[PDB]
């Protein structure tokens, strides 16, 4: 059973701006997603200090970057805290309203899209490179869910029947046809070294041959 939801209007606006604005420095999407993963890992790590059983769903804290040329996907996997259904449907959109407004105002006053993370809405930069984003997530207190959106004002959420992931988040970027450079090992390595070299969790870049 797939449920379909409308984004908050301000978030639909933001996604349209990200999709429509001419802006060549698209590579910053990766830093933003990796930062989100790091923050999610920090959260579970801290909670585990007071309740060690929170790592019963997995003790490894890491980030994997997985390109797949045949599927034209780049997947950012973390074993962080994960998101609940309420996060996916309501809470993330609600908290993002203020940051989205501030970002759009800053852009009008001379900021650029690479500053998106300063406003707490860097996830949406995925739409610089992806025509569709699928997010598979599992929080200790909730079931495994799949969220998905191709923009256009709506997103879907369903319970995920796929491979159970233990705990964490997988952001699957279905890349646009002209954005396949982000499947290349030398390109991803370049970007991680430039913008994510000090992240406090192991980042493993998977390869293909």
Residue 11 or 133 with smaller CB distance to Mg ion: 11
Q: State yes or no: residue 99 binds ligand 7PP (CB under 6 A).
A: no
Among 10, 14, 31, 37, binds ligand 7PP (CB under 6 A): 37
- Write down how long the chain is: 209
Q: State yes or no: residue 132 binds ligand 7PP (CB under 6 A).
A: no
97 is in an annotated binding site: yes
DSSP 162-203: S---SSEEEEEEEE-GGGGGGG-HHHHHHHHHHH-TT-SS-E
Site for ligand 7PP in 50-79 (CB under 6 A): 78
Q: State yes or no: residue 99 binds Mg ion (CB under 5 A).
A: no
Q: Is 110 exposed, middle or buried (0-12, 13-18, 19+ CB in 10 A)?
A: exposed
Which residues fall within 8 angstroms of residue 209, CB to CB, at 6 or more apart?
Answer: none
Minimum distance from CB of 92 to ligand 7PP (Å)?
Answer: 4
Partner whose footprint covers residue 99, from Mg ion, ligand 7PP, none (CB < 5 to 8 Å by kind): none
Q: Report the Cα–Cα distance between both ends of the chain, in Å, rounded.
A: 37
Q: State yes or no: residue 100 binds ligand 7PP (CB under 6 A).
A: no
Nearest to 77 by CA among 101, 109, 43, 41: 41
Distance (Å, rounded) from C-alpha 43 to C-alpha 198? Answer: 18
Residue 44 is given by DSSP the state H
From residue 9 to residue 38, the character string flagging contacts with Mg ion as x (rule: CB under 5 A) and all else as - is --x---------------------------
Residue linked to tokens 């009008």? 108
123 is in an annotated binding site: yes
Among 83, 146, 173, 183, binds ligand 7PP (CB under 6 A): 83
Task: Enumerate binding residues for Mg ion (CB under 5 A).
Answer: 7-8, 11, 93
Task: Enumerate binding residues for ligand 7PP (CB under 6 A).
Answer: 36-37, 40, 43, 78, 80-83, 87-88, 92, 123, 135, 147, 169, 171
């Amino acid at each position: 059973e797939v449920e379909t939801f409308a984004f908050q209007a301000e978030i639909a606006q933001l996604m349209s701006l990200i999709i429509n604005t001419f802006y060549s420095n698209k590579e910053i999407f990766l830093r933003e997603l990796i930062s989100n993963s790091s923050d999610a890992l920090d959260k579970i790590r801290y909670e585990s200090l007071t309740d060690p059983s929170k790592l019963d769903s997995g003790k490894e804290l890491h980030i994997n970057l997985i390109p797949n040329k045949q599927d034209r996907t780049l997947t950012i996997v973390d074993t962080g805290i994960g998101m609940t259904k309420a996060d996916l449907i309501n809470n993330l959109g609600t908290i993002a309203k203020s940051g989205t407004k501030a970002f759009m105002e800053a852009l009008q006053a001379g900021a650029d899209i690479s500053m998106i993370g300063q406003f707490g809405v860097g996830f949406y930069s995925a739409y610089l490179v992806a025509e569709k984003v699928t997010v598979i997530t599992k929080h200790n207190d909730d079931e495994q869910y799949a969220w998905e959106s191709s923009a256009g004002g709506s997103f879907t959420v369903r319970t995920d029947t796929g491979e159970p992931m233990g705990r964490g988040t997988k952001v699957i970027l279905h890349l646009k046809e002209d954005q396949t450079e982000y499947l290349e090992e030398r390109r991803i390595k370049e970007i991680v070294k430039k913008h994510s070299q000090f992240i406090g969790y192991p980042i493993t870049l998977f390869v293909e041959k």
